[PDB]
Design a protein around this ligand. Structure first.
Ligand SMILES: Cc1cc2nc3c(=O)[nH]c(=O)nc-3n(C[C@H](O)[C@H](O)[C@H](O)COP(=O)(O)O)c2cc1C
Length: 110
Protein backbone atom coordinates (compact mmCIF):
# COMPACT_ATOMS: atom_id res chain seq x y z
CA UNK A 1 0.00 0.00 0.00
CA UNK A 2 2.89 2.38 0.86
CA UNK A 3 6.71 2.39 0.79
CA UNK A 4 8.50 5.31 2.52
CA UNK A 5 6.62 6.11 5.70
CA UNK A 6 7.02 6.78 9.38
CA UNK A 7 4.52 6.61 12.20
CA UNK A 8 4.77 9.14 15.02
CA UNK A 9 3.13 9.00 18.42
CA UNK A 10 1.71 12.44 19.29
CA UNK A 11 0.96 11.19 22.83
CA UNK A 12 4.69 11.12 23.56
CA UNK A 13 6.80 14.29 24.02
CA UNK A 14 7.58 16.07 20.73
CA UNK A 15 5.68 13.57 18.54
CA UNK A 16 8.56 11.04 18.05
CA UNK A 17 8.89 8.47 15.26
CA UNK A 18 7.94 5.04 16.67
CA UNK A 19 7.93 3.06 13.41
CA UNK A 20 9.76 3.46 10.11
CA UNK A 21 9.48 1.31 7.00
CA UNK A 22 12.59 -0.31 5.47
CA UNK A 23 12.19 2.01 2.46
CA UNK A 24 12.28 5.20 4.58
CA UNK A 25 15.66 4.04 5.95
CA UNK A 26 16.95 3.75 2.37
CA UNK A 27 15.60 7.17 1.32
CA UNK A 28 17.09 9.07 4.26
CA UNK A 29 20.27 6.98 4.79
CA UNK A 30 19.52 6.59 8.52
CA UNK A 31 19.22 3.31 10.44
CA UNK A 32 16.12 2.44 12.48
CA UNK A 33 18.16 3.02 15.68
CA UNK A 34 19.14 6.53 14.49
CA UNK A 35 15.50 7.48 13.82
CA UNK A 36 13.24 5.99 16.51
CA UNK A 37 12.34 8.40 19.29
CA UNK A 38 13.16 11.55 17.30
CA UNK A 39 10.86 14.12 15.73
CA UNK A 40 11.07 13.94 11.92
CA UNK A 41 12.24 17.61 11.66
CA UNK A 42 15.86 16.33 11.62
CA UNK A 43 15.34 15.88 7.87
CA UNK A 44 15.15 19.67 7.54
CA UNK A 45 18.02 22.09 6.85
CA UNK A 46 19.16 25.41 5.35
CA UNK A 47 16.88 25.56 2.28
CA UNK A 48 13.77 24.16 3.96
CA UNK A 49 10.97 26.69 3.35
CA UNK A 50 9.70 27.76 6.77
CA UNK A 51 6.27 28.70 5.37
CA UNK A 52 5.85 25.03 4.43
CA UNK A 53 7.10 23.90 7.87
CA UNK A 54 4.44 26.22 9.33
CA UNK A 55 1.77 24.56 7.15
CA UNK A 56 2.76 21.10 8.45
CA UNK A 57 2.82 22.41 12.06
CA UNK A 58 -0.67 23.86 11.61
CA UNK A 59 -1.96 20.66 9.97
CA UNK A 60 -0.65 18.65 12.93
CA UNK A 61 -2.21 21.15 15.37
CA UNK A 62 -5.58 20.85 13.55
CA UNK A 63 -5.15 17.10 12.98
CA UNK A 64 -5.85 17.43 9.24
CA UNK A 65 -4.21 15.73 6.29
CA UNK A 66 -1.84 17.80 4.13
CA UNK A 67 0.14 17.17 0.92
CA UNK A 68 3.14 19.47 0.50
CA UNK A 69 6.59 19.60 -1.10
CA UNK A 70 9.63 20.66 0.91
CA UNK A 71 13.42 20.56 0.84
CA UNK A 72 14.92 17.81 2.99
CA UNK A 73 18.40 16.40 3.57
CA UNK A 74 19.77 12.86 3.86
CA UNK A 75 22.20 11.80 6.62
CA UNK A 76 25.17 12.68 4.38
CA UNK A 77 23.68 16.12 3.60
CA UNK A 78 22.26 15.34 0.15
CA UNK A 79 19.45 17.80 -0.62
CA UNK A 80 16.20 16.36 -2.02
CA UNK A 81 12.63 17.49 -2.66
CA UNK A 82 10.39 15.55 -0.29
CA UNK A 83 6.88 15.07 -1.66
CA UNK A 84 5.21 14.75 1.71
CA UNK A 85 1.76 13.47 2.73
CA UNK A 86 0.58 13.66 6.34
CA UNK A 87 -2.45 11.80 7.70
CA UNK A 88 -3.84 11.75 11.25
CA UNK A 89 -4.83 8.30 12.52
CA UNK A 90 -7.68 8.12 15.00
CA UNK A 91 -8.89 5.25 17.16
CA UNK A 92 -12.48 3.96 17.01
CA UNK A 93 -13.40 6.37 19.83
CA UNK A 94 -12.32 9.26 17.56
CA UNK A 95 -9.23 10.19 19.57
CA UNK A 96 -5.96 10.87 17.77
CA UNK A 97 -3.55 7.96 18.14
CA UNK A 98 -0.83 8.36 15.49
CA UNK A 99 0.31 10.35 12.50
CA UNK A 100 1.48 8.62 9.34
CA UNK A 101 3.96 10.56 7.21
CA UNK A 102 4.60 9.41 3.65
CA UNK A 103 7.70 10.64 1.80
CA UNK A 104 8.75 10.47 -1.85
CA UNK A 105 11.99 11.71 -3.42
CA UNK A 106 10.77 14.24 -5.99
CA UNK A 107 14.30 14.88 -7.29
CA UNK A 108 15.87 13.31 -10.39
CA UNK A 109 19.38 11.94 -9.79
CA UNK A 110 20.50 11.05 -13.35
C1 LIG B 1 4.38 11.38 10.92
C2 LIG B 1 5.16 12.62 10.61
C3 LIG B 1 6.08 12.57 9.57
C4 LIG B 1 6.84 13.70 9.25
N1 LIG B 1 7.74 13.61 8.21
C5 LIG B 1 8.51 14.70 7.87
C6 LIG B 1 9.43 14.63 6.82
O1 LIG B 1 9.59 13.60 6.16
N2 LIG B 1 10.17 15.75 6.50
C7 LIG B 1 10.00 16.93 7.20
O2 LIG B 1 10.67 17.91 6.92
N3 LIG B 1 9.10 17.00 8.24
C8 LIG B 1 8.35 15.90 8.58
N4 LIG B 1 7.45 16.00 9.63
C9 LIG B 1 7.28 17.32 10.31
C10 LIG B 1 8.07 17.60 11.57
O3 LIG B 1 8.12 16.44 12.37
C11 LIG B 1 7.38 18.75 12.31
O4 LIG B 1 6.02 18.41 12.60
C12 LIG B 1 7.44 20.04 11.48
O5 LIG B 1 8.78 20.45 11.27
C13 LIG B 1 6.67 21.20 12.11
O6 LIG B 1 6.88 21.26 13.50
P1 LIG B 1 8.04 22.16 14.14
O7 LIG B 1 7.75 23.61 13.79
O8 LIG B 1 8.00 22.01 15.65
O9 LIG B 1 9.39 21.76 13.59
C14 LIG B 1 6.67 14.89 9.96
C15 LIG B 1 5.73 14.94 11.00
C16 LIG B 1 4.98 13.81 11.33
C17 LIG B 1 4.00 13.93 12.46
Amino acid sequence: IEKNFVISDPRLPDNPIIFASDSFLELTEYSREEILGRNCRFLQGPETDQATVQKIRDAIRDQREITVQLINYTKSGKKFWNLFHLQPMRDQKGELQYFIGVQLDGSDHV
